[PDB]
């Protein structure tokens, strides 16, 4: 429906993805990273039964399915998979074949080098797309937020990568990845919810707790505070209808659960904190940096939603950092949707058509191809 | 009822709007009253 | 209906809810941008 | 368990802690600088765990967990920590404690003054030591190497020092701090095995990557040579076994970790190189003191056991120097354990003896003592 050859931009989380055509603010729809199997063989007429289900086909008959991302901690190990998502997203939802079309995919500055060489293998052998392009997410952090320079904390589904950028450029010594992120929270909620008496164990349940994750809990700017009063009083509960018509309400868990981004022992892992962590990406920097820093901390991806997280991680950032320097917060409404926002505008930069992948280039050199043409 | 979540989702969405409006102003005040406030304090410190 | 009532009305309320807050932060920010400014003059002259 | 009346010596850094009694030629056993904490809360009863782990125990039992190292880049701040440490070190596993005797620790040459004054502090206020001296790794690193003459290239784990000696006296201005050691190589190793599709995050995993490095990595006397193949064949890979059962395979990361030395761009550091800063402790002594140097190029501490670095620093260093004369480099299997052997010369030598602080003068004089009696 397009008139010019504007690249499709996809953002794979390991939780969600946000695809639309660079050029737009939004992504034209979103869809869970999900390839759903049934585990469950239907017995009555007209109720559809697929061998496999893509996406929001994934969620709308996860009662009877398997639900597998083929994304882990922020790498594709399933590509079989990830054709499915992206003929669908992009075939489907936003009416482009990808043939016509050059693309462009993200991945963290860590990410293991293979999801990059499949984004990039898949679309050109698959889809035969004309061109393509692996973006940082941390630069699509800064372009949606606003910013060339700041600390950006992607907190995605899968892992909260933690950079520094000064001036447009990285500041790898300081990089701090952290094995704690959004599908922690969800799998933590399901076992928080449990001791409440509302057993979560099944793929279908997990969404269900994705979705109360989503509308009732919050990280709280005093844990110890909320947690006594939320421990002592109804007055801190918020209920959430289920499904099958039963109700649950969350008390302190509604905090207890994101507390974990703060207290990461809560789900095994060995860390400070996301506060000490991206605190330990601003001090960490040279000490004529440090400055740009502390007043330009820069949210994307989800769990940045959480009502209490931006004032919170700036008050421990405050905290722990030195007095005179200015601590600041950049929580955009493009909150969770910025990555994919950043690949529409990298997509479409003058700067930047020079960066993509020809399917020329591709083939001459292989699937490595993306090591040395991306970044 | 019949209109009623077309007068609530009206109102959502206006006030979604200015909400909007009122929250751009709200970061670029708060952006223009933390330089500001450093230019005070740099000028301060001078 | 009810369902998108209540849905289109909860982001009513909450939309009108935080539009105030917008207007209100973007509103003392305003205030506080000001005083911030008038302060910086008051700096800037002394 | 030991009758001979002599001093003990421990050289103590931010990895491990090497220790013995002194007149030997090694140590009689090395620690790493750990006090271990749990990360866990215990469920079962008669699962044993305990409120902290010393040395070999933490490290051992470090899969639970959290392993704090006292040493800050050559400085000690933890100073409670390394009480426990050396309490362990001497009283438990050497079995020899300063109470008895005299006791020799280490230090840079520009480490800042508290650490000295607190090593010295804590042998005579915790361990009731009859006396005390703190003493130079570069003067250490060359008695054990046999000479009086040369550059101490004293790679430890949190700081390489890079310090000259001319007929027994110091030639300061020719000192070339580095803030890059093993404990560095180790974390840029984690970054790059993570690119590989193996992340390491924790500090158990660090312990992992260290035993790779270790075992695995190498700094090559042509770098881009193995590196182009490294970087383009399975023949240049190497398997490590994980203690979870996966293996991993390294390439060109085999070596890209250790060139930082050569290198230290690789991990943000704003320095020359190794070889570079090697080469300017012997241009900026006198003309009369650089040839002797130049012959003289001493390897100490660890990183030393890399191939390709005794015969890469000395190529590295004569295709800088002028001809005819000879460059050469000393690195015998005392490397990394040759502080520790040069701490036991010192301590011994009995052009020594008045060197020594006893349990009187300081007493007397409190722990700035050490800047009178030491250096």
Redesign the interface.
């Given at each position: 429906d397009e008139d010019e050859t504007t690249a499709l931009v996809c953002d794979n989380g390991s939780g969600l993805v946000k695809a639309g055509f660079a050029g737009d603010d939004a992504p034209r729809a979103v869809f869970p990273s999900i390839v759903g199997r049934p585990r469950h063989q239907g017995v009555m007429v007209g109720m559809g039964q697929k061998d496999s289900y893509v996406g929001d086909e994934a969620q709308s008959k996860r009662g009877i399915l398997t639900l597998k991302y083929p994304i882990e901690?922020g790498?594709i190990t399933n590509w079989d998979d990830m054709e499915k998502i992206w003929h669908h997203t992009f075939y489907n939802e936003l009416r482009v074949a990808p043939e016509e079309h050059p693309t462009l995919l993200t991945e963290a500055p860590?990410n293991?080098?293979?999801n990059r060489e499949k984004m990039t293998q898949i679309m050109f052998e698959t889809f035969n797309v004309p061109a393509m392009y692996v973006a940082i997410q941390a630069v699509l952090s800064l372009y949606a937020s606003g910013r060339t320079t700041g600390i950006v904390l992607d907190s995605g589904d899968g892992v909260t990568h933690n950079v520094p950028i000064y001036e447009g450029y990285a500041?790898?010594?300081?990089?701090m990845?952290?094995?704690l992120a959004g599908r922690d929270l969800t799998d933590y909620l399901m076992k928080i919810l449990t001791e409440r008496g509302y057993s979560f164990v099944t793929t279908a349940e997990r969404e269900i707790v994705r979705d109360i994750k989503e509308k009732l809990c919050y990280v709280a700017l005093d844990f110890e505070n909320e947690m006594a009063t939320a421990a002592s009083s109804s007055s801190l509960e918020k209920s959430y209808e289920l499904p099958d018509g039963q109700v649950i309400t969350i008390g302190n868990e509604r905090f207890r659960c994101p507390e974990t981004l703060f207290q990461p022992?809560f789900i095994?892992?060995?860390?400070a904190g996301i506060h000490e962590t991206t605190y330990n990406s601003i001090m960490k920097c040279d000490i004529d940096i440090r400055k740009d820093l502390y007043?330009n901390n820069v949210m994307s991806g989800g769990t940045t939603m959480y009502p209490g997280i931006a004032d919170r991680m700036q008050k421990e950032i405050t905290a722990l950092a030195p007095s005179?320097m200015?601590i600041?917060i950049?929580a955009?409404?493009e909150r969770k949707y910025s990555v994919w926002i950043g690949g529409s505008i990298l997509a479409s930069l003058s700067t930047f058509q020079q960066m993509w992948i020809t399917k020329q280039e591709y083939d001459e050199a292989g699937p490595s191809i993306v090591h040395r043409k991306c970044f | 009822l019949k209109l009623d979540k077309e007068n609530a989702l009206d109102r959502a969405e206006q006030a979604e709007a200015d909400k909007k409006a009122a929250e751009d102003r709200s970061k670029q005040l708060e952006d223009e009253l933390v330089s500001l406030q450093k230019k005070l304090k740099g000028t301060e410190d001078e």
């Open positions: 901690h790498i860590l293991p080098k293979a500041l790898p010594h300081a990089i990845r952290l094995d022992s095994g892992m060995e860390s007043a005179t200015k600041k950049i955009p409404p | -």
